[PDB]
Design a protein around this ligand. Structure first.
Ligand SMILES: O=P(O)(O)OC[C@@H](O)[C@@H](O)c1c[nH]c2ccccc12
Ligand SMILES: O=P(O)(O)OC[C@@H](O)[C@@H](O)c1c[nH]c2ccccc12
Ligand SMILES: *Cc1c(COP(=O)(O)O)cnc(C)c1O
Ligand SMILES: *Cc1c(COP(=O)(O)O)cnc(C)c1O
Ligand SMILES: [K+]
Ligand SMILES: [K+]
Lengths: 249, 389, 389, 249
């Protein structure tokens, strides 16, 4: 909850937009993943969206699904992900950290217990990809009790009732209309439709969104430079600083 | 929603927001369809004149000789396609047409659902694309060819993951953007609402016919109806009409595989734990930390890692009872039916018969009128059994 | 004899003296059976509750779209066993039981008759021994296993000659000494009387149902009924009830194989000459000096070197017309039915459909109500077609 | 017709029984077959029963069917058989010659024409294995018109009506009751039930039959000594003289 307010407020004073990169925890390896994350952070990432390898990525296409395969090949477990999250939080106190989850890994050993573990490690928000607003009640109530921001996706085929729900239920940011969202006082919208070029970040901000999220683009770079860990980071740094520059004023 | 998405604590619609409109669209059409006499007449005509309903109810005297058990087999193996799958695939196809859709999207494992989607689509002028994983393809080559012959577009998916649940991801992803003109054809009484309800309603004729047929032959309802449970469609189809007949036992049979204790089985309802996946909250095969596991069974048609929401519910309240049958027990029931009645049962249905034989043999002097849902034929299994024997 | 053994000049009982008593015994029992209401009720019960009759009559709109032809398919592919064979095999089995016999003797080529003999025997508690030639066995391995599973004793015959007509010799030789307790189950409307008559009477329900069904659907009889002719059983089964309906055309379709002119065909009725063999006088595939030749067809189920006596007769008087269809034409009808109606027809029935398609396509503006006897399913043929495609 | 009367009359004056060996024309080869036949004749055979290779030997078991295979492998045709028959008749004027035929080779180019060809070559009788008395009319009428004796088989399961028919229809000999046959004045009965030992020939005669026919036994010897043509004939001579001796008084 807290960290998002602080970030968007600061970005606002700077007439700057937020750039949030997505990455799969443990891809291509745990050690390699921590390095990637630090590089993203210190390259200009305003927030982070991290996914934990799930056996059945429903709302995922090619690039992202392959990332999970790589994480699983490395034997990455949810337990190891939360250990990584604690370390990342220990190194970076203010950067908002969001999790992309699938309902089962949240529900597995108790929904509330999951959110407690999130708060304990310093996670700020959780977007459960396969839970529509119609089934979000126990997830959002638990997130709230633990000071976690429940993130909701606002699809292109969204209607008024949905807009109103996402507005009252969501916290932190709205995973993306823009004018209606602000009308209902929704959390700052962050566009996530295949954002892969600097021109797309500036366009997102210009349209009234508070920022943009780029996932596959980041994953591509990793998938592209597996055999060259150093070139992977180097290219990841260049990509991020370019995307961040495009949100800046 | 217009109908309850839950069966107690089980069910729901755990899908990405983007897919909710498709689900609500389908639920609305289904409701209209059910109220529409013309839809019912068209659906009925197809089942009768195209698929071959009503299927027969065969009294098997030879196998129950010397015991007090009277066994009847609901002949779904005689249905066009050789399996009960056709009923609901025809219904869903008419439903897609009602919604003005021209495409059908499906995914397969055992091949039977892909072939079924293909026959219905070909028959009703629908463009059908079927997703299948490489590993699964090579094994089900005959069914792959069958699908192509029927004009179906078998799309080869291969990215590490190459199984039913793993191929569903691409089928759903497609539907997410194509739902305006395409209908995702789910093959069992599972997944997100309204699928568990639609599939049951489109399979319930099995039970309605059985009731009428049993009353005609015996003048009484059966003591129990037994059906194998892969995802739950043939089972719920048989159970449905008997649910309010409290005197009628409903027995669902899950695959025990190499034996429950070995872990290599496909019986999540009784030997798994509730989770959230496949767009539903239901018992499933999963690791301690929530990762979904694969089911095992000599019969591929029963390798679904979860079970329909309505079955998990029927169990919780004690209305239906579920048990398991090993590969070996299923193989024995298979051979026994062949030699004594001249009927080659599918390895799937053999689990249901194997249990009926157990009920009989353990208590030979117990008078009981049983009906086993013979969901399909085993012509496809002769090679498998052949290799084991 | 009690009934006429001849159909004009064709038919008779050309068997060694030793076998005449068995033939006269069978003819007498058949006659009693036909007069016996109890036998008819038992035969009917089996066909209904065990085999799945009446089979459906499917109106195929998709294939006849854009033409004035209305095509209906008699769904014998939906019969228990996947082929029309079951009807007469069940009847003959009840007949053997009527005669107090406990054994059934049979011979096979395509495997379908052996499997059919096996299912009926298993069902009715009869010891069944099936003769098959080595060369033929290896090819029909799946059906061989099916027969064994059904308790049938597949006896491997191999002495130079190893085909149907060549294996018949051992089956008959056996019956010569076993006829007191064993019944030879012939699989087609051929051989010595009373077989041509018995098989027709035990297959005539196909035509009787079609007549009632066509009258129900169209309120008129068809312009023509078309059926493939291997030995003549499915064809005579369809024709029988329509013979006195002079307005109804009866069209029998023989296998043209690679093409009549190539000599590699299986169409003796129209492209062979009367001879004496198989215990009957009928048109056959033979050399100039009287040595019987082998028939050819993409479909093994139509590789009989001769034809039923009643067909040769129906042709002589101009009551029924016979034509031929090439492997290629049959393959096209096979693929066309799959893609347009979602029905996998047997390669045998595909010859009958291929002709109906020809009648339609050659004269698109000719109004005609046609019925094609879809004698069986082609699941068994997918590999064959697969290899050609 | 004629030759049988002459033979049975002579045998009668000698209180001797007839021994008739069966062989397939052209087995194992045409040249080899003529030799076998001459050896049978000059060893003591009273009559001969010769079969022409037919593609589908209905009333035939293993031994005989294999003989046909051998004849066919040698390319033996019905045409070649009739040429052999003429030569055999040219060498032996009095020995009765019977043919074992299958309906198709008789019917093929006209029944009557077949019988004319038989008379022309000097054949005395024809037994059409797959033609029961119920279908014999055109065959027997044709045989008679051409002075050929129509032979009928009298089975063990035969009844009175059959006995009476075989008696009035058959000529030459009755392929085998014995007392009834003589009552109806049937042609001299010749038993053919697996006659393979001298003891069986004497037993056949003692029972009242005019002789015995041995087929498979002769064929066995041929099938047994294929690789040794000379030993084949030698053994065939020994077998025949033994069987003939057993009919003698
Ligand atoms: O790859 P894209 O088009 O740049 O968008 C990021 C996306 O992959 C990431 O946010 C994400 C991972 N899994 C998801 C599941 C649903 C919605 C979004 C996601
Ligand atoms: O082989 P046997 O049992 O000794 O009998 C001679 C027999 O083979 C011969 O006469 C014969 C050859 N073909 C036949 C057909 C039917 C009756 C008899 C025959
Ligand atoms: C598909 C299949 C099943 C398993 O699934 P359900 O959804 O449980 O019905 C059972 N029997 C046959 C013969 C099948 O093909
Ligand atoms: C056995 C067979 C036939 C061929 O034989 P008929 O005796 O002519 O009927 C035709 N169709 C099918 C599907 C068969 O199995
Ligand atoms: K299951
Ligand atoms: K034929």
């Amino acid at each position: 909850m807290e960290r998002y307010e602080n970030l968007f407020a600061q970005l606002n004073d700077r007439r700057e937009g937020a750039f949030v990169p997505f990455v799969t925890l443990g891809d291509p390896g745990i050690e390699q993943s921590l390095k990637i994350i630090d590089t993203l952070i210190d390259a200009g990432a305003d927030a982070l969206e991290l996914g934990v390898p799930f056996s059945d990525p429903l709302a995922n296409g090619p690039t992202i699904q392959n990332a999970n395969l790589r994480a699983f090949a490395a034997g990455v477990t949810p337990a190891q992900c939360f250990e990584m999250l604690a370390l990342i939080r220990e190194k970076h106190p203010t950067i908002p950290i969001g999790l992309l989850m699938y309902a089962n890994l949240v529900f597995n050993n108790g929904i509330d217990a999951f959110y407690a573990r999130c708060e304990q490690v310093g996670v700020d928000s959780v977007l459960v990809a396969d839970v529509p607003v119609e089934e979000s009640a126990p997830f959002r109530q638990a997130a709230l009790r633990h000071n976690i921001a429940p993130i909701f996706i606002c699809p292109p085929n969204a209607d008024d009732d949905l807009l109103r729900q996402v507005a009252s239920y969501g916290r932190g940011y709205t995973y993306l209309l823009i004018e209606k969202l602000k009308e209902y006082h929704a959390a700052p919208a962050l566009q996530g439709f295949g954002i892969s070029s600097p021109e797309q970040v500036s366009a997102a901000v210009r349209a009234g969104a508070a920022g943009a999220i780029s996932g596959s683009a980041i994953v591509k770079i990793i998938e592209k430079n597996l055999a060259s860990p150093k070139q992977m980071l180097a290219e990841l740094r260049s990509f991020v600083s370019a995307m961040k520059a495009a949100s800046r004023a | 929603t217009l109908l309850n998405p839950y069966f107690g604590e089980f069910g729901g619609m755990y899908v990405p927001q983007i897919l909710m409109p498709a689900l609500n669209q389908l639920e609305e059409a289904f409701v209209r369809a059910q109220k529409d006499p013309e839809f019912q007449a068209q659906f009925a005509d197809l089942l009768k004149n195209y698929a071959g309903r009503p299927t027969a109810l065969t009294k098997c005297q030879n196998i129950t000789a010397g015991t007090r058990t009277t066994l009847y087999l609901k002949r779904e193996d005689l249905l066009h396609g050789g399996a009960h799958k056709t009923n609901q695939v025809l219904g869903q196809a008419l439903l897609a047409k009602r919604m003005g859709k021209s495409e059908i999207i499906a995914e397969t494992g055992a091949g039977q659902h892909g072939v079924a989607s293909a026959l219905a689509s070909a028959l009703l002028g629908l463009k059908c694309r079927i997703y299948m994983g490489a590993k699964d393809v090579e094994r089900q080559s005959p069914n792959v060819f069958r699908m192509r012959l029927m004009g179906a577009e078998v799309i080869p998916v291969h990215s590490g993951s190459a199984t039913l649940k793993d191929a569903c991801n691409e089928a759903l992803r497609d539907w997410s953007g194509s739902y305006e003109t395409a209908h995702y054809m789910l093959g069992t009484a599972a997944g997100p609402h309204p699928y568990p309800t639609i599939v049951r309603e489109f399979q319930r004729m099995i039970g309605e016919e059985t009731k009428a047929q049993i009353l005609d032959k015996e003048g009484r309802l059966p003591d129990a109806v037994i059906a194998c449970v892969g995802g739950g469609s043939n089972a719920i189809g048989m159970f449905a009409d008997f649910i309010n007949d409290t005197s009628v036992g409903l027995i669902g049979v899950e695959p025990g595989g190499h034996g429950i204790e070995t872990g290599e089985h496909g019986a999540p309802l009784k030997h798994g734990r509730v989770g959230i996946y496949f767009g539903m909250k239901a018992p499933m095969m999963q690791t301690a930390d929530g990762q979904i596991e694969e089911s095992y069974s000599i019969s591929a048609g029963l390798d679904f890692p979860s079970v329909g929401p309505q079955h998990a519910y029927l169990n919780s309240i004690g209305r239906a009872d579920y048990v398991s049958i090993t590969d070996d027990e299923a193989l024995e029931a298979f051979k026994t039916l062949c030699r004594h009645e001249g009927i080659i049962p599918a390895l799937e249905s053999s689990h249901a018969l194997a249990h009926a034989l157990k009920m009989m043999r353990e208590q030979p002097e117990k008078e009981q009128l049983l009906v086993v849902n013979l969901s399909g034929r085993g012509d496809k299994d002769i090679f498998t059994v052949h290799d084991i024997l």
